[PDB]
């Protein structure tokens, strides 16, 4: 699954993304 972490659009429009139990070397800054 892919999850999106947001502080709320009434605070900011930045976003972070969680790729669930995927090794972070095969996803396709801060990794």
């Amino acid at each position: 699954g892919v999850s999106v972490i947001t502080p709320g659009t009434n605070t900011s429009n930045q976003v972070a993304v969680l790729y669930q139990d995927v090794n972070c070397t095969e996803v396709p800054s801060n990794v």
Binding site: V4, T6, T9, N13, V15, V17
Partner: protein
């Protein structure tokens, strides 16, 4: 087999490009044809010069013409309606993470 045309006219000031706002397009016609279309071209109007007898490219005068062409793709759009029945804003999912 149908040919559908949608249109809109909007006033803007001196911008180099397409504006930043939002405007929906109301439908004009739904012609029942059944025609196989893969190419198209734009018609331009030229005026006759009267300063030469010939019909060649020197015999027609013209102004300046430019247009913008983009292509449609099957996407999913979330449309926010108004209380009068007017699409005031929208967003295209599969655009970014937040979208």
């Amino acid at each position: 087999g149908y040919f559908k045309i949608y249109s809109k006219h909007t006033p803007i000031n001196l911008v180099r490009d397409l504006p930043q706002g939002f405007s929906a397009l109301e439908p004009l016609v739904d012609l029942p044809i059944g025609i196989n279309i893969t190419r198209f071209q734009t018609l331009l109007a030229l005026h006759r010069s009267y300063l030469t007898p010939g019909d060649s490219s020197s015999g027609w005068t013209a102004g300046a013409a430019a247009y913008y062409v983009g292509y449609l793709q099957p996407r999913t759009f979330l449309l926010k309606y108004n209380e009068n029945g007017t699409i005031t804003d929208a967003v295209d999912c599969a655009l970014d993470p937040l979208s």
